[PDB]
Amino acid sequence: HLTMPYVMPGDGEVVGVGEPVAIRFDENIADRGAAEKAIKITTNPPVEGAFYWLNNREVRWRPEHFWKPGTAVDVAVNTYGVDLGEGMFGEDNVQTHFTIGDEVIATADDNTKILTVRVNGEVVKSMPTSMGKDSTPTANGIYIVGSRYKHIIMDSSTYGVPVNSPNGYRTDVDWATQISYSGVFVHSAPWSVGAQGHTNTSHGCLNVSPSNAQWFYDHVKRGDIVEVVNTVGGTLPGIDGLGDWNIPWDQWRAGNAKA
């Protein structure tokens, strides 16, 4: 019984200031503490960080605050032959190096209905946006940018939710940047340009103009941050998959290796 670790982000990547280290196993880990002790993270400049498990197969490590731009990170997952509990052994090691890019923080403020992109503190874009309508609102919180798609079909049935049901949907969109595993995206919405900056019309996604969505796709990278503030929604879950920063540091740091 072997289990293979997979580390994100990829070796040689540049990622945003929000990117956690992720170590994800292809089997449930019975002894989380054993996995944690086998994983060594080196930072330059050196920063404290801590492990927190999103579920039984994936642990994350990050610092208290967003990474400092230019930080170099080395991840040594020394799991080959290590007993991860219930007679499961690590199949191999993984060794990954990556670097933190520029500080890119985009804030969507429902009081202004503008998505402002700041690069190292400077506004580079101000994008009118239309967010989730009151019945399906966009959650407030900190979102980590994930994958991007030039065109993607978003079908609720991907999440076990029938399309012709209350929480259902089926649409195709261009220039989509993923910001939660729950299915929140920044994307092109030419049909809501009138409403962008004025009225929330979406199902939760951040609708922007075709040009702004393409800009986002081209220039915002994995690990950059989107913050949503002042909506009528709740808070993005800490264990979403891209919601890691919504867990306060004191809780994160304490971890969940015994849970």
Ligand SMILES: *SCc1ccccc1
């Ligand atoms: S963008 C569609 C969507 C539905 C539910 C939750 C989040 C996003």
